[PDB]
Amino acid sequence: AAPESFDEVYKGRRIQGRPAHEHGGGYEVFVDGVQLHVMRNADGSWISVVSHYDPVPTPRAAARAAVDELQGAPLLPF
């Protein structure tokens, strides 16, 4: 049972999330329109491929962590 969708501007960038060589994602996240691979762990936390070792509670938190990691840089698609 997937998290709610979201859409906001965070540190100047548009982050979006929605229920839906990589895994089976039941949830999609985008940073300025580029898909960010994210994953849910057994305990309900989330990670993304630009912060894979640091679980955060929600997909929005994972999108925000990716924006923080990117420091303005465009995301490349997976």
Partner: protein, 273 residues
């Protein structure tokens, strides 16, 4: 073939290790290791097939991956072996690991760019090609995202756990493998990736050469655990969906099993165990 603590390498050993890594990068071989790891990182899932991570095969898979990489190093310079980083001992930004004659140091605060050492982008010798964050320079923020590396006392607490792994054989498990990996508990291996920051904190973490020294120490700790618990061995031992059982083969190689990898001494020894 002896794996040595990085802190003990001679100047000649550091020079030869660096040169062999830079040749693997130059020739294109290095980036394919980064790519393989990223594919597993992105595919292993707690409710589905899982081989490289978040699963009992985290340890033998990384053992074989590091052996593949060491063999490639040895194809450039047969004297080179993988050193290990005891991050419980060498825990500050001042460790010689991070000196300009070895891996170089932390990234600058503006954009995390590493500015010294052989892998700094300014050398022209370490392009970041396999990437998700679009920038093409090595980045680090040592101690940025988490204040401290694990301590010896924390490592000891994990080494004392008797069971290798437990159902559900994923990031929710109790047992040694998942505590060493770090998804539960005081957190060893995951926290080191987070502590280094930059590419080491991502799905393309072998872009940083410290990846290999981190995992060589994680691999050493598995060997130490085995010595502490000679009545404990790899599980599961057959018929487990989505999980590599003891005598099942492992992707991507398909021709090796966890069983073939439990005893490191068939391949290398440590300076001290």
């Amino acid at each position: 073939t002896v794996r040595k603590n990085q802190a003990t390498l001679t100047a000649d050993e550091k020079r030869r290790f660096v040169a062999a890594v830079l040749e693997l990068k130059r020739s294109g071989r290095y980036d394919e290791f980064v790519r393989t790891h990223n594919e597993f990182i992105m595919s292993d899932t707690d409710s589905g097939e899982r081989t490289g991570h978040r699963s009992p095969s985290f340890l033998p898979w990384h053992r074989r991956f590091l052996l593949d990489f060491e063999q490639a190093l040895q194809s450039v310079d047969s004297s080179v072996t993988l050193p290990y980083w005891d991050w419980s001992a060498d825990r500050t930004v001042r460790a010689s690991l991070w000196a300009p004659d070895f891996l170089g140091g932390t990234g600058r605060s503006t954009d995390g760019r590493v500015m010294d050492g052989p892998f700094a982008a300014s050398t022209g010798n370490w392009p970041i090609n396999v990437r998700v964050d679009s920038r093409t320079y090595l980045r680090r923020s040592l101690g940025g995202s988490v204040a401290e590396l694990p301590t010896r006392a924390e490592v000891e607490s994990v080494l004392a756990i008797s069971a290798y792994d437990l159902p559900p054989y994923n990031s929710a498990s109790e047992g040694f493998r998942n505590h060493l990996e770090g998804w539960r508990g005081v957190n060893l291996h995951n926290r080191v990736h987070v502590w280094v920051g930059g590419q080491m904190a991502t799905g393309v973490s072998p872009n940083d050469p410290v990846f290999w020294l981190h995992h060589a120490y994680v691999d050493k700790l598995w060997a130490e655990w085995q010595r502490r618990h000679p009545d404990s061995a790899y599980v599961p031992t057959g018929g487990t969906p989505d999980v590599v059982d003891l005598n099942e083969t492992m992707k991507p190689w398909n021709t090796v099993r966890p069983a073939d990898l439990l005893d490191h001494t068939a391949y290398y020894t440590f300076d001290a165990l």
